[PDB]
Design a protein around this ligand. Structure first.
Ligand SMILES: CCCCCCCCCCC(CCCCCCCCCC)(CO[C@@H]1O[C@H](CO)[C@@H](O[C@H]2O[C@H](CO)[C@@H](O)[C@H](O)[C@H]2O)[C@H](O)[C@H]1O)CO[C@@H]1O[C@H](CO)[C@@H](O[C@H]2O[C@H](CO)[C@@H](O)[C@H](O)[C@H]2O)[C@H](O)[C@H]1O
Length: 717
């Protein structure tokens, strides 16, 4: 299979270099429209009882267009907001902004308009705000409408106004993606180019992995844009495409180009060198890519629309990177030939480190597993959470505006729990039924009494403009003090016994996050099984042995545990926050699953890169110890360079202004730092020496089944 592609990618090395570049360049110019069609919805289990409640509330009671924009106005530096002139002109400026953007601005209500809104002006009368509703029946439509007016909105009062609310914060959160890509393009791509020049020594040899990575990120963006035609694609799709199309899409090029240069040095002519580098390195790259696919395919079981799009992005990027690395790059090398330049590796440093590692293997593995289990201890205080304005750096000037709004006008932002009363007959709900449901619900403590009286608790929702006043659905709502009691009292609410025919759905933003967390935790028992079973079999196919898949699975699990522990200790416990410019916050549950999948997949890739050389050397008659020596001395520099490349790519994203991407990239950095600077150098050789000659053992039926498939060719005569 791989020994046939090596022979057919050289006979037609132009029809593969001119067609697979067309499909990635003209297919990448199609992805330039991806930024418009990416959505921000998908963090919630769309089949839960809280999403149902939110949809019914929006349908019947109309969307809550009150927190979209709040614009804080300040007195004329030694005056009050009740100034006859200043108030008049701020009015006369909010008018002619409502009417000069009629397609985006629904209206505006504030103290400057109605004097009966004393809750919209501070007690000293020096700060006031107005609420600007935005037209749009979809969240992304509302965000686009806000983006169409934001540059002209800030000019009110003369630049003095401060914008806050749902839409400015959403714009700030989604506006960090462009900044991240700009930082990547101007800081990591040239730095990765310099790293590639240092590892290879030529501009042509170093250029080829960059070309493959660029083609991968163009084609993956094109594929994602194609996927956005049918379903929703999240905003996080493109940063992950960048990560996985410039870290591993460049690792694959590194390995294949290095293998080609190794085969050229042996004296093999151009065609034979291409065939052999395919047979070995392209096979290893293909197995690494399918291992990533297997690791990240389990995310398809989770109901979050965020994860279902991020897994598509990951799968598309890795498959395109592998296809490029086995189609275009071998053709690029076959055309170039010996012009890419334009027993000592095993006797140097890498061959002498794993000669002390295997001489006292317990001393180099027991301390490391001990110090790598102690890194798991911090994960106990995980405390997942949700997205808010605090996912921005404390100096964002938008988070600052929102925090100043919260300080000045407390009580306006409510985070209520909503009970959706709904007759099964589709009949007008009797006001006595709402009374009985409220009476049952007015027996659970921990809910915000507005004026310390029961008569205003569990108030009915307000009818908005886009409200279809269905008489068979009524919704009540209260916020709760101590948001930590959300999980404890959501179950207390969901245990009410409706009187005769009512069916109460409990929703609200606090419930929307707990439902997503529980929906994600209800499929870990099967997602983990899939992630383990699909990688064990694939690594048995890659390494014609049974013990090695188990060993690599154990090391990958240990690396994942240590990475999660470090992430918790840094981002949840709040260490190095002042250095990295973030606020210690609860993590997001879907991103934890994404981190698990990516870390497991990439650690397994690095294990495959390390052990494929050992398996290849063993088939050449080498003993078990020599197999390890050659295997991890021939690939030491290449794996170090690949780890540095991905570390640079992720560290370009660690400096992001979004905490989500910060700890995603930092988890990747920690995982690869461990897997390339502790695991590879000490744990794998020591364990493989302790196991003995049984590292290479697969039953006879297993190897003949591997041959029947056609994937067993790990030996080059
Ligand atoms: C790379 C970028 C990708 C996107 C990045 C994320 C962008 C998305 C924005 C995220 C977001 C706006 C955040 C801004 C808040 C500012 C409020 C200012 C108000 C000023 C007056 C809304 O996010 C949207 O929420 C919608 C429904 O909730 C949902 O709509 C759809 O949902 C369904 C289908 O998804 C379906 O039912 C249906 O189709 C739709 O209904 C959208 O899908 C979803 O995007 C989160 O809201 C915030 O979350 C916080 C929970 O932590 C919450 O509590 C915080 O504050 C409390 C203090 O009180 C404090 O106690 C808490 O401790 C604190 O945690 C906040 O109160 C809340 O505001």
């Amino acid at each position: 299979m791989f020994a046939w592609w090596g022979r057919t990618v050289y006979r037609y090395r132009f029809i593969v270099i001119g067609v697979m570049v067309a499909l990635c360049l003209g297919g990448g110019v199609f992805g330039l429209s991806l930024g418009k069609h990416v959505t921000q919805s998908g963090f919630y289990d769309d089949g839960s009882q809280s999403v149902q409640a939110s949809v019914l509330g929006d349908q019947v009671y109309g969307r809550d267009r009150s927190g979209h924009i709040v614009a804080i106005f300040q007195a004329p530096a030694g005056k009050t907001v009740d100034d006859p002139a200043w108030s008049k002109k701020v009015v006369d400026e909010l008018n002619r902004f409502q009417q000069d953007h009629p397609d985006q601005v629904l209206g505006w209500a504030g103290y400057l308009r109605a004097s009966q809104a004393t809750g919209m002006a501070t007690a000293d009368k020096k700060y006031t705000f107005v609420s600007i509703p935005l037209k749009g029946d979809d969240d992304d439509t509302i965000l686009n409408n806000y983006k169409a007016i934001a540059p002209d909105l800030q000019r009110l009062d003369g630049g003095t106004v401060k914008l806050a609310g749902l839409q400015p914060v959403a714009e700030a959160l989604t506006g960090t993606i462009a900044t991240d890509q700009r930082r990547m393009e101007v800081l990591a791509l040239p730095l990765v180019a310099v790293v590639l020049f240092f590892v290879f020594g030529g501009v042509i040899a170093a250029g080829l992995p960059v070309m493959v990575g660029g083609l991968c990120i163009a084609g993956a963006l094109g594929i994602m844009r194609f996927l956005a035609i049918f379903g929703p694609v999240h905003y996080f799709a493109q940063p992950v495409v960048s990560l996985i199309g410039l870290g591993i899409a460049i690792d694959y090029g590194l390995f294949i180009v290095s293998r080609f240069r190794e085969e050229i040095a042996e004296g093999y002519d151009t065609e034979t060198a291409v065939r052999r580098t395919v047979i070995t390195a392209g096979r290893t790259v293909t197995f690494s890519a399918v291992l990533i696919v297997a690791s990240a395919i389990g995310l398809l079981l989770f109901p979050q629309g965020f994860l279902k799009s991020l897994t598509y992005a990951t799968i598309a990027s890795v498959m395109l990177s592998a296809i490029l690395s086995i189609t275009v790059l071998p053709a690029c090398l076959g055309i170039l030939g010996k012009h890419v330049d334009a027993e000592e590796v095993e006797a140097g440093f890498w061959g002498k480190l794993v000669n002390r590692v295997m001489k006292r293997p317990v001393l180099f593995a027991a301390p490391i597993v001990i110090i790598m289990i102690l890194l798991i201890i911090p994960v106990g205080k995980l405390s997942l959470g949700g997205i808010s304005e605090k996912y921005l750096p404390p100096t964002n000037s938008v988070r600052q505006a929102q925090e100043e709004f919260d300080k000045l006008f407390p009580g306006y932002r409510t985070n209520p729990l909503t009970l959706v009363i709904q007759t099964s007959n589709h009949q007008p709900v009797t006001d006595a039924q709402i009374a009985d449901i409220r009476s049952k619900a007015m027996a659970i403590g921990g809910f915000i009494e507005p004026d310390n009286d029961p008569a205003n608790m569990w108030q009915e929702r307000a009818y908005a403009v886009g409200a279809s006043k269905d008489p068979s659905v009524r919704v009540l709502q209260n916020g709760l003090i101590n948001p930590a009691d959300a999980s404890k009292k959501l179950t207390e609410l969901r245990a009410i016994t409706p009187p005769k025919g009512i069916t109460v759905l409990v929703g609200g933003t606090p419930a929307l996050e707990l439902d997503s967390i529980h929906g994600l935790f209800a499929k870990m028992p099967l997602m983990v099984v899939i992630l383990l079973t699909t990688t064990i079999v694939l690594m048995f196919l890659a390494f014609g042995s049974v013990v090695l898949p188990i060993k690599a699975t154990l090391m990958s699990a240990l690396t994942l545990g240590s990475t999660m522990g470090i992430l918790t200790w840094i981002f949840v416990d709040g260490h190095f926050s002042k250095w990295l410019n973030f606020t210690p916050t609860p993590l997001t549950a879907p991103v934890i699953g994404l981190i698990i999948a990516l870390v497991f997949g990439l650690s397994t890739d690095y294990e495959v890169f390390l052990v494929s050389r050992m398996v290849e050397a063993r088939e050449r008659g080498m003993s078990t110890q020599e197999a390890i020596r050659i295997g991890t001395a021939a690939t030491g520099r290449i794996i170090t360079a690949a780890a540095l490349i991905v570390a640079v790519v992720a560290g370009a994203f660690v400096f992001s202004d979004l905490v989500m991407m910060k700890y995603l990239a930092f988890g990747l950095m920690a995982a690869l730092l461990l897997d390339a600077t502790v695991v590879r150098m000490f744990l794998v050789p020591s364990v493989m020496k302790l196991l003995g000659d049984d590292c290479w053992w697969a039953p006879r039926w297993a190897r003949r089944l591997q041959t029947r498939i056609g994937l067993g060719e790990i030996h080059l005569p």
